[PDB]
Amino acid sequence: GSHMDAAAPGTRVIDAATSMPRKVRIVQINEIFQVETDQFTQLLDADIRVGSEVEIVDRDGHITLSHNGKDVELLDDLAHTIRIEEL
Structure with a gap:
């Protein structure tokens, strides 16, 4: 059961954060150059x-991330693009 898609099989970080926030598991990053x-x-620490997996926070202007207790809000990696499968 291999899903082609040709553009990330899992959901999107901007389509799964827009609505009810849930725990999304990351399997690969994107956007670097x-x-x-x-x-x-902030991602360093x-x-x-x-x-x-972690719950995203689609804010009007930015996108924060909740990880147990700490939170990181930055561009790339945990913001746009990137693959996210599982729950």
């Missing part, structure tokens, strides 16, 4: 890599 902004600052 050459970004040396704050994106690589927050050891949040592909594998664990």
Whole structure:
């Protein structure tokens, strides 16, 4: 049962956060090229890599992430694109 799709089999981070927030599991990241902004600052301390699931917070202007107790809000990785399967 392999799903082609040709554009990420799992749901989207902007289509599954818009409505009722749920725990989304990350299996791979996306969007990089050459970004040396704050994106690589708050995520440094927050050891949040592909594998664990977390509840997203679609805010009017930004997108925060809830991980047990700590929260990280930045671009790329945990914001737009990126694959997210499982519950």
